[PDB]
Amino acid sequence: SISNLSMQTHAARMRTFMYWPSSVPVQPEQLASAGFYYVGRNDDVKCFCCDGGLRCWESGDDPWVEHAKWFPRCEFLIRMKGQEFVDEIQGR
Ligand SMILES: [Zn+2]
């Protein structure tokens, strides 16, 4: 089931990044697209579906690749990217 139903829509997730720190090299649009919303502390984000949390984002980090690497069984990630994409990331 969905861990945080209130954050299931892209527009609700985007609102959470209003005060996302400027020096973070990963943008709200990319994080929100991958299911992540900002919890309001440093650069901590969580997936609305699996509740997986990620922080300390680096330049070049791809939110979809990170979602597949750390949280492969997420239903949202599998529905958006497909099991084939997840399997490829998991295999590397
Ligand atoms: Zn997830």
Author numbering: 260 to 351
Please share text taken word for word from the publication where this structure appeared:
BTK, a validated target for B-cell malignancies, presents a reactive cysteine (C481) in the ATP binding pocket of the kinase domain that has been co-opted for the development of potent covalent inhibitors, including approved therapeutics such as ibrutinib. Here, we present a study of an irreversible-covalent degrader (BCCov) of BTK as the target, and cIAP1 as the E3 ligase. We, therefore, set out to expand our understanding of target recruitment within the framework of covalent degraders targeting BTK and co-opting cIAP1.
Interestingly, the cyclohexyl group of BCCov ligand also appears dynamic and adopts a unique rotation as compared to the binary BCCov-cIAP1Bir3 structure that we have additionally solved for comparison. While the tight affinity and slow off-rate of BCCov to cIAP1BUCR1 presented a challenge in determination of absolute Kd we can confidently assign an affinity of ≤ 10 nM, which is in close agreement with the ~16 nM affinity reported for the IAP warhead alone. Here, uniformly [13C,15N]-labelled cIAP1Bir3 was pre-incubated with either BCCov [cIAP1Bir3 + BCCov] to generate a cIAP1Bir3-BCCov binary complex, or ([cIAP1Bir3-BCCov] + BTKKD) to generate a ternary complex.
